[PDB]
C-alpha cells in the first residue's frame, strides 16, 4: 500500500473533490430467470488523465435446480446449474478501453505437516507355573498431512482484453449428506455419479430420489448474485463521446440422470447440456454522464 | 471495493449531502403471533438517476413450538416451525422496480485434510527356557477428513424479480441432548425420527416426552427476528408518484408425533402441515416521502 | 512505525497538502495475450527533496494452459505457465533513480512441535483351567512435527538496482485430485511426473488425459494479475526533465508430455521451453507531469 | 499506551503542527550488489526540547546464492548469505546522539501442553472346545508437548550506544524438501550437513546437486530488504549545526561444499568465509534541514 | 471503558486542548553497557486538579552473555543476564507523588480439557483345522490436558508506593536445541543443569561447549529494551516547584559453569553472582516544564 | 448497540459538549502495603437529568507472599493472598446513588465435542508348516471432550445496591511446576495440599521448600492492580451538595503450612487466616466539582 512506500494513505487514489454521477438500470429477463442490475458511476477527476466509468454488474441468476424428465418410475432427469457467467464487451470500433476489473484470480495456499515418531516398549510376563517371559520392541513412524479449503463454487476472472472482460462461477464439488465430496466427474462402478442421489437403493420413483434442494448449496436452486466491477476509461478530447457496451448473463446447466439397475440406483452426469444467455446493450453518454438501454 | 481499483473509499456510494426521510411502521398480528416492523428510508440523491426507498423488514415471528394434541397417554403431537418467510411484492402495473436486496446467497466452504502414515516396528522376545523369538513388521495408513460448519437454520434469498423479493429461514438440523444432529428426514427403524423425543423408553405420558424448549434452538419457541433490506427505485419524472407494496410474513409448521410401540417411543415428522400467513399492504408516497398502511 | 518512536502517525509520510497527478495507460498485446495497465501518480511535495513518480504495473497475463500437440493417441503435449514476470528498467544515461518498490521478500516461518510420552500398562489373564498369568509393560515415545504453508505460486522481488526492478511469480507446487503436492521436479519411476495426469492407466486418447483446467490453479489457465509498485525519484533542478522507462511483461511456459508405456501413462516435464516477452517504452514528462507511450 | 494511564491518545507524541522536511538518498553499489536507500525526516517541534532526525535505512542487499567452484564432477562449492547487517555510526566528537531505534528485541514465547490419561480394558475369549478365558488390564500414560514458531531468519537489534546502532538478520534454519529443518551446524555422520543438498546419492555433477534457489528462502538468492529506523537528537543552541554519519551495509557469506564419498554425497558448511561491506558517509545540515552524500 | 457506562469515549481522559511539553534525555553508561533514555511529557490540563509528568524509561540494557573464565580444557564459566531491572524513586521529602504506572501485572490463564472414551470390540478367528474362537472386549479411558503459554522472560511490576516504582524482567525458561525447557533450577543427576550446554559428551574445550548466542533468546546477548511509563502528580500551588528523581537501570548476572566429569559434561548455575547498577539523578522544573541531569 | 436499532453511533451516550472536571487522589498505606489511587471525573451534561461522578479505583495491593514462621527445620508457614477486595460505600443518609459499575459478571462458556468411530479389521496369518489362520474383527468407540479456560484469579462483582458496590479478585487455581492445577481445597492422602511445595521429599529446611514466587502468579508476590469504575448520580436541585464516600481496600491471606512426616513433606492450607483492611473517607463537593480527603 501507500504506507509501505512512505506515502500518506489515499494520496494516489482517484476521486477526491469530484462530483460523481451514479445510476441504476434494472431489467428482469423472465424467460431466462435473470434479474440484471447495472450500477454505474461516472468519475471525471480533473487530476486524472481520463474519464472513468465504473460499472458494477449485480442482480441474481436463478439456479433453476429442477427435475425435468420422468420416463416412468425407473428413470428421471434433473437439470442443474454448473456455471454462472457474466461478460462485458465493447465493440472493436470504440475508443473507450477496459481499464480495470475486480475481483481477480488469487493464489491459493495449502498447509503441510510432517511428523516423525519413534518409541520403545518392553514388558515382562509372569505365570503361576514359574514361566517368565520378556519382550523389548522399537518402532518408528513417518507421517505427512495436507490441509486446504475447498469452496462449493469457484469465482474465476477469465482472461481480459481492453475490449472484453468476464467472470465465471463454476461448480467445484459438493457434500451429499455428509458423504463425498462429489464433483461432475465422480464415478463409482456400482452407483455411477452420486452427486444428487438421495438413496442408494430406495424403492421410490426415480423422480423422488434426487437430493432435496434445501440440503444442497443455495446457489443450485435459489441462484447466484454477481458482484463484479469493471472500470472503463475514455479520453477527454475524443471526437465521439458515445459508447456502446454489451452485458451478458449466462447459465450453463448439466443433466443428471438417475436410473434403476434392478438392484440399486445409478447416476450419470452430462456436462453443459443447456445454456441460457441473456444479453443487453447499453449506451453510455460521456458528456451527459448517463447510461441508458 | 473501491480501493482495489485505485478509487477513494466511498466515492461511488449513494447518499452524500442528502436529507434522508426515515420512518417506522409497527403492526402486531395477534392471531398469527407476528410483530411486524417496517423501517423505511427515502433517499433522493441529486447525483443519482432515480429516487431510492430502502425498506427494512424487522420484527419477530414467534416460533410457537407447542404440544397441540394428546390422544391418551400413548400418543401426542407437537407443532413446530420448520420455516419462516418474508416476502415483498409490487403489483404488476407499478413503475417502481426492486433494485437491490440484502442478504444474498453466499458460497459455503469446507476444509479437506489428507494424511499418509507409514511405519516399521520390531521386537525380540526372550524366555527363561532359552527360547528366543523375533518380529519385524511394517504398516501404511491413508486418511481423509472433511470439516464444515452446520447452522441450525439456513437463511436463503429466494430468486428475485424486479417485482418481488423474498427470504426464507429454514430448519437445517438440530442436536438432541448431545446426540445427532437430526433433521426432518432422519429415520431409525426402531425409534423413527428422534428430533424432539426426550427419552427413548421412558414410562411417562406421551405429552411429557417432548424435548424441553429451553434445550432446543431458541428460534423454535421464542421465534425468529428478520433483518432484511430491499431497495426500490423510482423514476423522477414519472406521472404517478404513488406505489403499493405488499409485505408478507409466513411461518410453516411441521407436525411431530410420538407414539408408544409397546417397547419404546417412536417419532414421526410430517412436513408443512400448517402455514400461517400475515399480509400487509402499504402505500408509498414518493413526493411526500412517506409510507402508510 | 512512528508510534513506536513516540511520533504521531503519518508525520513522516510524503504527500500532505499536495496535488497529485494521476493517469492510466492501457495496452493489449494480442499475440502474447497480455493486458498491460500502468497507473501512474506524480507527487511533487514541496517538503520533499525530490519529485516522485509512483508507477503501478497491473493488468493480466493470461496463463494459456493448453494442449498443443497430439502425436496420435499415445502421445500428447501441454504448454503451461511456470512463471510470470514484470520488469521496469531505466536507461543508464538517465538521472532518475528507482527509489522504492513493493512488494518485497518476506521471511517465512514454520511451526515446530515436540512430544514426549511415557506410559505403563499391566494385565492379568485367567482361564477356566486355573491358569493365571500376568503382564507388566512400559513404553516411551518421542515425536517431532513441522507445519508450514505452501502457496501454489510464489511472488519474489528480484534483486533491484537504481535502474531496474523486477518481480517474478513462479510455480511452487500443486495438488492433483487430492494427491501430491507435485512440482516441476517430481519423479516416480513408474509414472514419471504426475503434475497434470488425469488418470494413471485410463484407456483414452493422450490429449484427453490432462488435468481439467477448472481443477487446477486459476493462474494456469485464466492467468495472473500483477499488482506491483515502483517509486522513481528525480532532482528538481535537473537540466533534462524527460525520462524513458521500459516495462516488460513475461510468461515462461513449460512443456508437459504424456505418453503411453503399454501399461500406464508416463508424464515428463521440460522446463522453460517457451518465453513470451511484451515490452513497452514510456515517456515521462516531469514538468507536464504526464506519461505517454 | 496513553489510554492505560487515562490520557488522550496521541497526547504525548511528537510532531503536531510541525512542518517536516523529508528526503531520499539512493545509491547502488555494483561490486557489492547493494541498493542502499536513506529516507530522512527532519522534525523541529517547538514543544520538544531537541531537533529530531528520523533516518530509515531501506533498499535491498542481494543474497548472491551461487555456485562458485567446480573441482571436477565430484567436488563443488556454493556461497550463500548467512547474515545481513545494517549499522549507523556517529563520530565520537559529534554532539548529536542516537535517541531511539526500531525494531527492538522482543520476548519469544512457547506453548506447553501436559496430558495424563488412564484407562481400563477387559475381554473374554471362547473357543469351540469350551475353553473360556478372561483378561483385565489397566494403563496410564503421561505426555508433554512443546510448540513454537521458527523463522528462517532472525532480525536482532545489536546493543546500541548513543553513537552507534545496528541490526543483523541471521540465518536460523531451513526446511530442505520437507526434511529438517537444517542449520549451519547440522551434522550427520553419513551425509555431513544436508542444508543445500539436492539428492543424497544422485549420479550427476557436484555443481548440479545443490538445492534450487526457488525451493529455498527467497532471501538466499533475491536478498533482504532492510526496514530499520533510527532517531537522532540534537540541541537547538549548539554551536556547530553539521553532523556526519556513516551507514554500513554488510553481507556475510558461508561456504557450503559438496563432495562425493564413493557411496553418497557429503556436505560441509564453513562459517563466515566472506564479508561484503559497503560504507557511505552522509552530511546532516540541521539548520538547512537536509542530508547529502 | 466509557462506552460500558453510557459515556462517550475519551470523555474522562486527560489532555484535551492542552499544550504538552516533551523532551528526551540520553545517557550511555559504558562501564555497565546501558543506553538510558528518558522521554518526558509535561501535561498541565486546566480541568485536572494537578500537574502531570509522564516519564517513559527506554533504551537498552545489554545482555552481555559471554564466556568469562577458562581453567583449562575441562572447566569454563559463562556469565549471563537472569534479570533486568528499572526503578524510579522520589526522595521522601518531595511533595510530588507517583500516581500511575504501566505495564502492570496481568492474570494468566490456562486451558483445561477433559476426555472420556469408551468402546467395544469383537473378533472371530478360524484356521484350516476347524478351530473357531471368539473374543469380546470393552474399554474405558479418562484423560486430562492442560495448555498454557510460557514466555522466555517475564515482565513484573514490583509493588509500588507513592515514592518509588519498579519493574523487573526475569528469566523464566528456555528451549535448548529443541530440548527442555530448562530453567535456573533444572537438575539432572548425570548432566546437572543443561541450560547452555551445547553437547552432552563432545570432545572439545569447555569454553567451546556453550550454546551459541544466536540459538538462544536475543535478550541474553543483544539485550533488553525497556518501555515503562510512570505518571508523577504535583500540586499547582505548592511552594517549591522543583523535584528530584532517581532512575536506576540494573542487570543481574548468573554464573553457569561447565566441567568435564571424565564421562560427560556437567553444568552448574549459580544465581545472582553479579549485579550492575547504573543510577542517574534528574531535576524536574515544573514551572519551566523541563527535565535536566 | 445503537447501530442494532438503526441509531447513529454514540447518539445516546453522555458527555458531548461538556466540560469534565478530573482529578487524582493518591495515598500510600505503609502498614497494609496498599497504593490507593482515586481518579475522579465530574460530568455535568445539560441534557442529562443528573450530575455524574465517575470514580475509578486504581493503584496496587501488594501480594505479600512470604514465609512468616519457622519451627525448627521440619515445620514452616507461608502467608499468601487468596483474595483482593475493593469496596465503595455511601452513607445511608446520602441523597446520591450508585448508578453504574464496571466490570460486571459475564457468562462463561465451554466447548463440547462428541466423537463416534467404528471400524473393521481383517487378518490372514501363514506359516512354514502350511498352517493358515484368519481373523475378522469389528469395533466401536464413543468419546466426549470438554474444553474451557481457567484463570488463576477470578474478578467478581459482588451484588451492588444503590449505596454499596464492590469487587473481589479471588484465587482460583494454580499450576505448580507443570503439575496440577491445585486450589485451596486440593487434598492428597500422602502429601496433603501441594499448592506451594517445591519438592515432595527433598532433604532441606522447611522454610526452603516453598515454591519460588517467580515461578508462581505475579499477583501472589508483586500484587494486584485494581481498575474499577463506579458512577454516582446526584440531583441538580438538591439542598445539600456535599457527599461522603468510603473506599476500602482489602487483602485476605491464607496460611499454608509445610511439615515433615518422616517420609515426605505434607502441606495444609488454612483459609482466611488474616485480613488487612484499609479504609479512606472522601468528601465530594458537587458545586465546586472537587473531591478531597
Render E7-41 in DSSP notation, one character per residue: B-TTTT-B-TT--EEEEEEEEEETTTTEEEEEEEE
Peptide bond into C103 cis (omega under 30): yes
How many angstroms separate the CA of residue F123 from the nearest CA in chain B?
A: 13
Residues of A with CB under 8 A from a CB of D: 6, 112, 114, 144
Q: Which residues of B55-93 are buried (b: 16+ CB within 10 A; e: fewer)?
A: bbbbbbbbbbbebeeeeeeebbbbbbbbbbbbbbbbeee
Backbone phi and psi for residue D69, each to the nearest 5 degrees, phi listed first: -145, 135
Q: In Å, what is the CA distance from C138 to each residue of C118, C181, C250, D134, F259?
A: 7, 39, 62, 22, 34
Nearest CA in chain C to B112: C178
How many angstroms separate the CA of residue A281 from the nearest CA in chain C?
A: 23
Looking at beta carbons, which residues of chain A come within 8 Å of B159? 33, 35, 60, 62-63, 222-223
Q: Are E233 and E49 in contact (CB under 8 A)?
A: no
Q: Which residues of A143-170 are buried (b: 16+ CB within 10 A; e: fewer)?
A: bebbbbebebbbbbbbbbbbbbbbbbbb
Using CA atoms, how far apart are residues E24 and D43, in angstroms rounded to an integer? Answer: 14
Q: Are A232 and A53 in contact (CB under 8 A)?
A: yes
How many angstroms separate the CA of residue F163 from the nearest CA in chain E?
A: 18
Looking at beta carbons, which residues of chain F come within 8 Å of D112? 178
Nearest CA in chain F to B58: F5
Q: In Å, what is the CA distance from F199 to each residue of F204, F220, F283?
A: 10, 20, 52
CA angle (F232, F237, F240) in 5-degree steps:
70
Backbone phi and psi for residue A134, each to the nearest 5 degrees, phi listed first: -165, 160
**Among the listed residues B240, B235, B251, B84, the one whose alpha carbon sits nearest the alpha carbon of residue B153:** B84
Q: Are F195 and F186 in contact (CB under 8 A)?
A: yes
Nearest CA in chain C to E58: C5
Using CA atoms, how far apart are residues D22 and D25, in angstroms rounded to an integer? Answer: 10
Q: Which residues of B194-220 are buried (b: 16+ CB within 10 A; e: fewer)?
A: bbbbbeeeeeeebbebbbebeebbebb
**Among the listed residues A15, E242, A284, the one whose alpha carbon sits nearest the alpha carbon of residue B49:** A284
Which stretch of DSSP H or E encloses residue E219?
helix E218-221
Enter the C-alpha cell of residue F226: 485494581
Using CA atoms, how far apart are residues B83 and B272, in angstroms rounded to an integer? Answer: 9
Give me the count of residues in chain E: 293
Using CA atoms, how far apart are residues A61 and A81, in angstroms rounded to an integer? Answer: 10
Using CA atoms, how far apart are residues D124 and F263, in angstroms rounded to an integer? Answer: 42
Q: Which residue has the cell 502429601?
A: F191
Do the Cβ atoms of D178 and A112 come within 8 Å? yes
Q: Are A172 and A151 in contact (CB under 8 A)?
A: yes
How many angstroms separate the CA of residue D66 from the nearest CA in chain C?
A: 14
Q: Are E220 and E79 in contact (CB under 8 A)?
A: no
Peptide bond into B102 cis (omega under 30): no
Alpha helices for B98-201 (secondary structure H): none
Query: What's the distance, Cα to Cα, between the start and end of chain A in Å?
Result: 38
Do the Cβ atoms of E136 and D124 come within 8 Å? yes
Looking at the partner chain, which of E54, E103, E144 has a beta carbon nearest the beta carbon of D116? E144
Do the Cβ atoms of E12 and F20 come within 8 Å? yes
Q: Are C270 and C255 in contact (CB under 8 A)?
A: yes
Q: Are F177 and E162 in contact (CB under 8 A)?
A: no
Q: Are D139 and D272 in contact (CB under 8 A)?
A: no
Using CA atoms, how far apart are residues A238 and A232, in angstroms rounded to an integer? Answer: 14
Looking at beta carbons, which residues of chain A come within 8 Å of D56? 6
Enter the C-alpha cell of residue E283: 531535576
Looking at beta carbons, which residues of chain F come within 8 Å of D144? 178
How many angstroms separate the CA of residue F213 from the nearest CA in chain E?
A: 11
Looking at the partner chain, which of D27, D37, D151 has a beta carbon nearest the beta carbon of C100? D37
Interrupted after residues, chain B (C–N over 2.5 Å) = none
**Method by which the coordinates were obtained:** cryo-EM
Instruction: Give the mutation candidate from D178, D215, D225 for the A interface (greatest A CB count, under 10 A).
Output: D178
Looking at beta carbons, which residues of chain D come within 8 Å of C109? 149-152
Which stretch of DSSP H or E encloses residue A120?
strand A109-127
Instruction: Give the mutation candidate from A6, A111, A145 for the D interface (greatest D CB count, under 10 A).
Output: A6
Which chains have at least 3 CB atom pairs separated by less than 8 Å from chain D? A, C, E, F
Resolution, given in Å to one decimal, reads 2.2
Using CA atoms, how far apart are residues A258 and A265, in angstroms rounded to an integer? Answer: 6
Enter the C-alpha cell of residue A189: 462402478
Looking at the partner chain, which of C6, C112, C114 has a beta carbon nearest the beta carbon of E39? C6
Looking at the partner chain, which of C22, C39, C178 has a beta carbon nearest the beta carbon of B114? C178
Q: In Å, what is the CA distance from C215 to each residue of A81, A150, B106, C168, C211?
A: 18, 11, 21, 24, 7
Task: Indicate the SS3 state at residue E75.
Answer: strand
Q: Are C8 and C1 in contact (CB under 8 A)?
A: no
Q: Are B10 and B25 in contact (CB under 8 A)?
A: no
**Among the listed residues A230, A96, C39, the one whose alpha carbon sits nearest the alpha carbon of residue B12:** A230
**Among the listed residues B58, B157, B147, the one whose alpha carbon sits nearest the alpha carbon of residue B105:** B157
- Cβ-in-10-Å burial (0-12, 13-18, 19+) of E165 comes to buried
Using CA atoms, how far apart are residues E39 and F86, in angstroms rounded to an integer? Answer: 33
Which stretch of DSSP H or E encloses residue C38?
strand C34-43
Using CA atoms, how far apart are residues F66 and A260, in angstroms rounded to an integer? Answer: 82
Using CA atoms, how far apart are residues E122 and F140, in angstroms rounded to an integer? Answer: 9
Three-state secondary structure of B190-240: CCECCCCECCCCCCCCHHHCECCHHHCCHHHHCCECCCEEEEEEECCCCCC
Using CA atoms, how far apart are residues C283 and C289, in angstroms rounded to an integer? Answer: 11
Q: Where does chain B show beta strands of DSSP type E?
A: 21-29, 34-43, 51-61, 66-70, 75-89, 97-102, 109-127, 133-147, 153-158, 164-171, 174-176, 179-182, 228-234, 242-260, 265-285, 290-292
Do the Cβ atoms of E178 and C144 come within 8 Å? yes
Using CA atoms, how far apart are residues E183 and E186, in angstroms rounded to an integer? Answer: 5
Q: Which residue has the cell 464444515?
A: B148
Using CA atoms, how far apart are residues F182 and F173, in angstroms rounded to an integer? Answer: 5
Nearest CA in chain C to D42: C12
Peptide bond into D218 cis (omega under 30): no
Nearest CA in chain D to E11: D8
Looking at beta carbons, which residues of chain C come within 8 Å of B6? 22, 39, 56
Q: In Å, what is the CA distance from D258 to each residue of D188, D211, D266, D267, F122?
A: 14, 11, 6, 5, 49
Distant-in-sequence, close-in-space partners of F212: CB < 8 Å, separation ≥ 6: E185, F198
Do the Cβ atoms of B170 and A224 come within 8 Å? no
Looking at beta carbons, which residues of chain B come within 8 Å of C39? 6
Enter the C-alpha cell of residue B93: 402495473
Distant-in-sequence, close-in-space partners of E71: CB < 8 Å, separation ≥ 6: none
Residues of F with CB under 8 A from a CB of D: 22, 39, 56, 178
Instruction: Give the mutation candidate from F137, F150, F178, F228 for the D interface (greatest D CB count, under 10 A).
Output: F178
Looking at beta carbons, which residues of chain A come within 8 Å of C155? 107
Query: What's the distance, Cα to Cα, between the start and end of chain E in Å?
Result: 38
CA angle (A240, A246, A248) in 5-degree steps:
170
Q: Which residue has the cell 545517557?
A: E27
Q: Are E77 and E69 in contact (CB under 8 A)?
A: yes
Looking at beta carbons, which residues of chain B come within 8 Å of A103? 4
- The Cβ of residue B283 has, within 10 Å, a number of other Cβ atoms equal to 12
CA-only gyration radius of chain C, Å: 29
Looking at beta carbons, which residues of chain B come within 8 Å of F6? 22, 39, 56
Looking at the partner chain, which of F6, F112, F114 has a beta carbon nearest the beta carbon of B39? F6
Looking at beta carbons, which residues of chain F come within 8 Å of D114? 178
**Among the listed residues D194, D251, D248, D195, the one whose alpha carbon sits nearest the alpha carbon of residue D219:** D251
Nearest CA in chain F to B39: F6
Looking at the partner chain, which of A6, A112, A114 has a beta carbon nearest the beta carbon of D39? A6
Looking at beta carbons, which residues of chain C come within 8 Å of D23? 48-50
Backbone phi and psi for residue D213, each to the nearest 5 degrees, phi listed first: -60, -25
Distant-in-sequence, close-in-space partners of C129: CB < 8 Å, separation ≥ 6: none
Do the Cβ atoms of E149 and D7 come within 8 Å? no
Q: What's the number of CA atoms in the CB half-sphere (13 Å) around residue F165?
A: 20
Looking at the partner chain, which of C43, C217, C222 has a beta carbon nearest the beta carbon of A108? C217
Enter the C-alpha cell of residue D215: 525451493
Using CA atoms, how far apart are residues B72 and A99, in angstroms rounded to an integer? Answer: 74
Alpha helices for E46-135 (secondary structure H): none
- The Cβ of residue C179 has, within 10 Å, a number of other Cβ atoms equal to 13
Nearest CA in chain E to C142: E179
Question: Measured on CA atoms in the order C213, C215, C216, C222, is the torsion positive or negative?
Answer: positive
Render B95-114 in DSSP notation, one character per residue: --EEEEEES-----EEEEEE
Question: Measured on CA atoms in the order E177, E180, E183, E184, is the torsion positive or negative?
Answer: negative
Using CA atoms, how far apart are residues F242 and F238, in angstroms rounded to an integer? Answer: 10
Backbone phi and psi for residue A165, each to the nearest 5 degrees, phi listed first: -140, 150
Looking at the partner chain, which of D39, D56, D178 has a beta carbon nearest the beta carbon of A114? D178
Looking at beta carbons, which residues of chain D come within 8 Å of E229? 4-5
Using CA atoms, how far apart are residues F286 and F44, in angstroms rounded to an integer? Answer: 10
Q: Do chains E and A touch (3 or more CB pairs under 8 A)?
A: no
Query: What's the distance, Cα to Cα, between the start and end of chain C in Å?
Result: 38
Three-state secondary structure of chain D: CHHHHCECCCCCCECCCCCCEEEEEEEEECCCCEEEEEEEEEECCCCECCEEEEEEEEEEECCCCEEEEECCCCEEEEEEEEEEEEEEECCCCCCCEEEEEECCCCCCEEEEEEEEEEEEEEEEEEECCCCEEEEEEEEEEEEEEEEEEEECEEEEEECCCCCEEEEEEEECCEEECCEEEECCCCCCCCCECCCCECCCCCCCCHHHCECCHHHCCHHHHCCECCCEEEEEEECCCCCCCEEEEEEEEEEEEEEEEEEECCCCEEEEEEEEEEEEEEEEEEEEECCCCEEEC
Q: Are C196 and C180 in contact (CB under 8 A)?
A: no
Distant-in-sequence, close-in-space partners of E223: CB < 8 Å, separation ≥ 6: D105, D159, E33, E60, E61, E62, E63, E64, E81, E84
Using CA atoms, how far apart are residues F215 and F211, in angstroms rounded to an integer? Answer: 7
DSSP conformation class of C108: P
Looking at beta carbons, which residues of chain D come within 8 Å of C47? 19-22
Looking at beta carbons, which residues of chain D come within 8 Å of A144? 178
DSSP conformation class of C221: H
CA angle (C19, C25, C26) in 5-degree steps:
150
Measured in whole angstroms, the distance separating CA A240 from the mean position of its chain's CA atoms is 38
Using CA atoms, how far apart are residues B16 and E182, in angstroms rounded to an integer? Answer: 62
**Among the listed residues C196, C192, C289, the one whose alpha carbon sits nearest the alpha carbon of residue C243:** C289
Q: Which residue has the cell 516396528?
A: B121
Backbone phi and psi for residue E219, each to the nearest 5 degrees, phi listed first: -65, -25
**Among the listed residues A36, A25, A69, the one whose alpha carbon sits nearest the alpha carbon of residue A277:** A36
Which chains have at least 3 CB atom pairs separated by less than 8 Å from chain A? B, C, D
Instruction: Give the mutation candidate from C176, C178, C180, C181 for the B interface (greatest B CB count, under 10 A).
Output: C178
Amino acid at each position: 500500500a501507500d504506507s509501505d512506500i512512505n506515502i500518506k494513505t489515499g494520496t494516489t487514489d482517484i476521486g477526491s473533490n469530484t462530483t460523481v454521477k451514479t445510476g441504476d438500470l434494472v431489467t428482469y429477463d423472465k424467460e431466462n430467470g435473470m434479474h440484471k442490475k447495472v450500477f454505474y458511476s461516472f468519475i471525471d477527476d480533473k487530476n486524472h488523465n481520463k474519464k472513468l466509468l465504473v460499472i458494477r454488474t449485480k442482480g441474481t441468476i436463478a439456479g433453476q435446480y429442477r427435475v425435468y424428465s420422468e420416463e416412468g418410475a425407473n428413470k428421471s432427469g434433473l437439470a442443474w446449474p454448473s456455471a454462472f457467467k457474466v461478460q462485458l464487451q465493447l465493440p472493436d470500433n470504440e475508443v473507450a478501453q477496459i481499464s480495470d476489473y475486480y475481483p481477480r484470480n488469487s493464489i491459493d495456499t495449502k498447509e503441510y505437516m510432517s511428523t516423525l515418531t519413534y518409541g520403545f516398549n518392553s514388558n515382562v510376563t509372569g505365570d503361576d507355573t514359574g514361566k517368565i517371559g520378556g519382550l523389548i520392541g522399537a518402532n518408528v513412524s513417518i507421517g505427512h498431512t495436507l490441509r486446504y479449503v475447498q469452496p462449493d463454487f469457484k469465482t474465476i476472472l477469465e482472461s481480459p482484453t481492453d475490449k472484453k472482460v468476464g467472470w465465471k462461477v463454476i461448480f467445484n464439488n459438493m457434500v451429499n449428506q455428509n458423504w463425498g465430496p462429489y464433483d461432475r466427474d465422480s464415478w463409482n462402478p456400482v452407483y455411477g455419479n452420486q452427486l444428487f442421489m438421495k438413496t442408494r437403493n430406495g424403492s421410490m420413483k426415480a423422480a423422488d430420489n434426487f437430493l432435496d434442494p434445501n440440503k444442497a448449496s443455495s446457489l443450485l436452486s435459489s441462484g447466484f448474485s454477481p458482484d463484479f466491477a469493471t472500470v472503463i476509461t475514455m479520453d477527454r478530447c475524443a471526437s465521439k463521446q458515445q459508447t456502446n457496451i454489451d452485458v451478458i448473463y449466462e447459465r450453463v446447466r448439466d443433466d443428471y440422470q438417475l436410473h434403476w439397475t434392478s438392484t440399486n440406483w445409478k447416476g450419470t452426469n452430462t456436462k453443459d447440456k443447456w445454456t441460457d444467455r441473456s444479453s443487453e446493450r447499453y449506451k453510455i453518454d460521456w458528456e451527459k454522464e448517463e447510461m441508458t438501454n
